[PDB]
Structure formats: structure tokens, C-alpha cells
Design a protein around this ligand. Sequence first.
Ligand SMILES: [Ca+2]
Lengths: 734, 120
Amino acid sequence: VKQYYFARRGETSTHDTSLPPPVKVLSGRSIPLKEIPFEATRNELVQIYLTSIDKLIKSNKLNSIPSQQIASHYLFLRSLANSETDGIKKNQILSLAKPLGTYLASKEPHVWKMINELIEKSEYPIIHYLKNNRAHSNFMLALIHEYHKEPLTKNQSAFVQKFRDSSVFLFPNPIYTAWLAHSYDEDSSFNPMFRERLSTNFYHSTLTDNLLLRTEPKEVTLSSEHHYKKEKGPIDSSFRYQMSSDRLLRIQGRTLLFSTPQNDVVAVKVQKKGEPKSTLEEEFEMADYLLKHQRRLDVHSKLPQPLGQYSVKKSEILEISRGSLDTLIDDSKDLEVYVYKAPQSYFTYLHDKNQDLEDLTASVKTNVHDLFVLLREGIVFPQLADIFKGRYQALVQLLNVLQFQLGRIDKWQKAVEYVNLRSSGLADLGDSLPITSLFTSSDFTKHYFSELLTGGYHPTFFDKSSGTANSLFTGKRRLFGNYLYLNTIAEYLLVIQLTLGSYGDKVTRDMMDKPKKEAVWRELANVMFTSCAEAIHIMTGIPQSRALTLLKQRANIEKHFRQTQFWMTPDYSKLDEDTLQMEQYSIYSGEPEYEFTDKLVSGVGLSVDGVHQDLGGYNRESPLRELEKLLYATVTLIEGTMQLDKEFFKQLEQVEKILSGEIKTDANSCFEAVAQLLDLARPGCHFQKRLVLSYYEEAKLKYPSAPTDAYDSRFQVVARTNAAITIQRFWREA
Amino acid sequence: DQLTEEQIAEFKEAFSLFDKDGDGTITTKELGTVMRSLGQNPTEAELQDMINEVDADGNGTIDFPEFLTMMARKMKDTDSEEEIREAFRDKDGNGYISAAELRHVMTNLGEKGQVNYEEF
Ligand SMILES: [Ca+2]
């Protein structure tokens, strides 16, 4: 039967609808918060960069400049020239590029041969030239600073201060998106980290921020039959489960668990101290909604059967529960309850030490699957875990100014203690949220993301003349839903991580064999990376096999295994300033050790309350650095792919209009359009390149007597690859 | 299901890439180019299962065995090697079958270059 989603993803003019007035009040005076537009400011810097190329040509200082940075200049010029639509602005760039090409051809003949092999392969050669550490050399700002001998406008200063680290941040939209997608490819050594004068700078969050500010504000529409839109009648609770004290198994929080002859469980969940009746109804109807649609959503969790939602006397409840070891229920005499039937596995949390590694990975794979399948359906779960307004932010550097890294996580094992991920799959689905609530000024986003919705102040943003504070950050009021989306993907995967970390710390303690615990933690790090790749594949359709490879180009599973083992066990607590300083070297191996001045508590580790381990020092960041690299590599693969595919299809429409005669132009500009479309195909995805090969061949029919010498080489590579695939799909014999 | 796993991976990728609203369904006016990116270029692919009016991935996949179990692979296979033969009618350049391209498990020979098909 049918399988599809009740949510449609579109676009909207702005998310800046009925948000807080963009004002910061400081010491009685109210300061308006104004946006520094990203595209206008970036385009200005390119025009400044172009005029500085001219001045460099006119100074005859072309020998005073290393050959590697003339190639970047030249290659970026020829890339910018192909990205520009009209032929006249394309000739100002080519006119600027020609002297740099004449000097290299004459005074640097080897670099000329190498970059010409790049020019023949792609139409944005600079993106392949910067698939390595050359991306850390900001050749454009160097040139501007050297030959634009005039102070930059305040907006231009703000931009470079925020995007110091790489010249890619100045690239026009299609070139930046293509570089960022290909920076994960198999032949790329680029990693967003570089060592300054013995200082190490990480800027992976800058990659995501520079991309998000080029995005259009997303909007999600839920159909009329969606759970949060279709009006259903009342809930029929005409059967009453009859509670007996001998049949009760266990008391889990505010839910009583009863035995049945069929070895499953009848659970009756009682009203919390301050929960209204409608919350337990919503849990009823959501369980009903998921059951009806399990086949259409391919839900893997074993969903409970909702049986009744009705009121009972408090006299009756406390008489039944007088036996076991048991506060969190309402004042007196009449308590609405929610009664449901569920397997026994629905009540074992996913961090239970009593799971073999085999059921653990299968259970995580079930939970990970349904979290993101349900995110596409338009349902988000903001309360998977008490991960604590004081709520933790998975991508904190995109949602605030002045923040730089993931903060400390307090009592981290207690934060997933009652996590809503079980062996059966997802659980406690009543406290959910429509995805449209991340894209609007709901009560959720107003309380938890006030800074992102207001606009952001900082003393260096304040301009004494106009009385306003200006920043790139205020520009995200128009886009804030795009941030909360990626932050939601990230905090799903953070909770998976803490769940795996809880399981790992409980299995490894009361265990002696040192290799048998490094095998467990290495397998958990593999579970965590696989989980990230399954999320990418559910959100983008990239095969999870290739999503894994692109993930491990960016995030190091070896470092992640060792950091998790180090910081989520209490073993480092039995150490001194000298032994751990040399054990921190093994888990970072090129990077600054985790600096902290707290006094450790024995048997626990870092602890503010002395009893439960935290993940990080008091007002310091989290020590799981590869985890934050992994979360950002994941959201950047997801959003970067979506952006690349939009750019791919916007150029596909141009090629089709050139072929059908709807845009009358010559043959060279036709082959330019097709080759440009090849650069926008996903890394490692062949059918996209096969499609572009099909268009190239039809262009050779519309313009039969046109030279293809500039393009035959790159499309023959796609032809030979396509031919090989059909031969290797003939291993119908092992 | 008459289709092995390296095909539904490409089909699910291509279906996902061309469903621009994240629906789970693609319009009739788009699977033409989805078709073109996969290899099959027909003119009228109608009489389909119209119960949903567009198609699911479920409908999309099962339609393809109606199309690739009908594609005689021998003609898809000679041009596959007419492509790698520059002159008419090799063994080392074929060693690139996967030494650069793809799956590189336990290759074979017949050298003495290769000439024509061999299905077995
Ligand atoms: Ca759709």
C-alpha cells in the first residue's frame, strides 16, 4: 500500500513575522539591533577584490607573490567568470585574469600545466584547488589588505571579522555550495582546522553559518489529514482495565506496569503534579495516529496500543501501589490516567547494561530510523531527555553571539536516565511538537531561543554615531527556522550519543579486561557514526554507505572512540596533573588538550555537585570535540546537499531552456551551461552525471558543427564510468 | 524483488533527488527526467497504478522491473564496450574495470585483448 509523507517542504519570504522587537535595553537606554546584509556585503568585497587585482597588475609586483597564490587568484578568477551569467561582466573578469595567466605561463610553467589540468576537468577549478590546506590561506583578504589601501566600511569589517578563516566564504553562492559539498569527497584532505602561531582554530561551525545565511527561509506545510490538523472526535474509553496488586510488575516513574497472561504489559500512566488532562489525551491520539499510519511511514518501533484515557479516584490508585518501592502525581481524589498495552521491551531503556552489543545496535537503528522518518512527517520531540532558559543547545555557536563551543553537560548520565528511546523503539510520544513550531514565534522558540529571534547585541557591534548595534547575526531573524531545524537534527544525535555513552560506562565498569572495554567503546563509536549516516540518508536520500564515507573524511572515528572512553568513564579521576596530561595527548593527538582548573572528585571525575559526573569543567566547554565535529559535519552534509541540489535544478532549468530554443544563444554558451551543471552534481552520485551526459549529447545535436575540444575530456570520463558500471553490474556470478 | 540492492540505492537516490517537496511522491511531469537520469528514455509510460495519482517510491520501484526485466542487457552491454574500445574489435585497459572505477573483487581474463560478449 501507499507510503509517503503528510508534509510538503516549500519556501517562504521571511521568518521575521511577529517576533520580539529587535531591541536590546542596556542601562536604561534601548539600542536598536540592525542587520548587516550578507549577500550585499559579500558582493562588495568581491568588487573590492577585483579592483585590487587590477592594482596588483598595474604595480608589476607579480614576482613578489608566491606562485601558489597566483594560481588561486587566477583559478578563482576563471571560476568567478563561469558563474556570471552575462557575457560583459564575464569579460571584465577574463580581462583581469589574462595577465595573471600570461605571467604564470611564462614565469611559472609547471603551475600553469597543473592548473590547466584542473581547468579542463571542471568549470569551477578553484573548488578542486582548495580541497586541501590551501583553503586555509585567505588569498583574497591578503590581496585586499595589500592593495586596497583604503579602510573598509564597517559592514565589510564585520564580515571579514566573522569570516576570516577562508577565501571560500567570499565565493558566490553556487561556487561556495559546490566547494562545501566536494570538501567531503574521497580525494579531499580539507578539514576546518588550522594551526596559527601555535594556536589552533576550529571553524567548522563557520562553514554551516556561511551556508545558512545564503539559504531561503524554509516553510513546511502539513496536509489536512495530518495529526496536528485533522479534527478527530472524542476518544472512546468504554473499557476499563481492572488493576490488581499481584499482577503489577514494577513501578516506573508515574506509570504502573501490570502483568498479563500474554506476557506483554498493560501500563497505566497517571497525571503528573501539574499536567492537564489534554496532555494525556494527546498521547492517546498520537499513539492512535502512529498505529494507523505505521505502514505508510514504515515505522519500525513497536507502538503501544492505546486502550483508554479516563479518570480514577486517588483512593484507588495508592491502594494498588502500596506494595512496591514508591510523589509525582496530582493533589487529590481524581486523577486522569492513560492506559496502554505494550511489549516488555518498550519499558527497558536503550542504555540498559543487560543488552548485548547486537540488540543494542539493532535497537539504536530502530530509534534513529523513526526519529528522522517522523521528522519528515512533521513531528519533532524536544523532550527526548532532560538535557538541561537552561536547555542545552546542540549547535550553540550558530544560535548565539559570543559563544564558541558546546558547553558543559551537567549530570550527563542522569540526563538520559529516563530517555524516551527503548529497545522497542520510540516511547512517551505525547509531548511532541509540530515542525511548523520551529519556523514560527511559538511559545517554545520565544522562551528557548530569544537571542536568535531578537537579533543579538555585543559592545563591538555598537556604533556610537547611529546609536544602533549592527551584526551579521541579526540577519538570521529572517532565517531562524533554518537554524532550529538543523539544531533539532543535531540534538537528536546528541541524545543518541549520551545514550550510547551511558550504556558504555555501565558495561565497562565491573569489567577487568582492558581490550574488552576498548572493543566495546570502539563499537559504540561505530554505532554513533552509522547513526549519523542513517540520518543523512533519511533526510537526503544519499546512500548510507556513501554518507558514512563523507562523514569520516571530516570526523575522525579513532579520536571519537578515545574521547568518549576517556571522558565518559571515571577512570581519569584516579590520576594526577602529569599522567592525564600525557593521556590527553593520545585522545587529541594534534590538538590542544582540554584545559581545566577544577579539582577532580575521586571515583566520579569532573563534578559540580560531587556525586554525578559532568562532561566538562564548570564554565568551560565540552571535551567531546570530535562529537561536535561529527554533529556539524552531519548538519552540513544534510543542508549542504539540499542547497547543492537546488543549485543543480536551477541550472538544469537553464540548460533545458537553451536546448528547447526558449533562450536564443550560441553554441559555446550552451556547452558552458551543460558543463556548469556537471559541477553541481552530488559528490559520488553517478546518475546525476549520467543525466548531464545525456544533455551534452543533445547539445551536440543542436550545434553539430561546434568545437567540443574544451569539454570532450570531462564528459568522456563520465561516459567511461557509465560504461564500466554496466559491465560491473554483470557480476550475476560470484 | 527482481531488483538487487545496487539498483534500488540508485533508484531511491534519484527518487529522493527529484521529489523536491520531500513529499514521498513525484509528479508525472518530473519522472521523465528521472527516467532520463537512469537510462530509460520512453515517450508514453502510462496505464500505471493511479491510485495515488502521482506515485510512491513503492510504486516507482516496482514499475522499474516492468522496464529493466524487459531491457535486453546484451545491447546495453556491447555499446558498453564499444565505448571503451577506441579502435574496432584490450586486457590491460580493461584492468581499469575497477582498478579505478568500482567493485574490484577477483577479476578474470581471456586475453590470449578481448573481442565480444561472454554471458555465463
Ligand atoms: Ca511531493
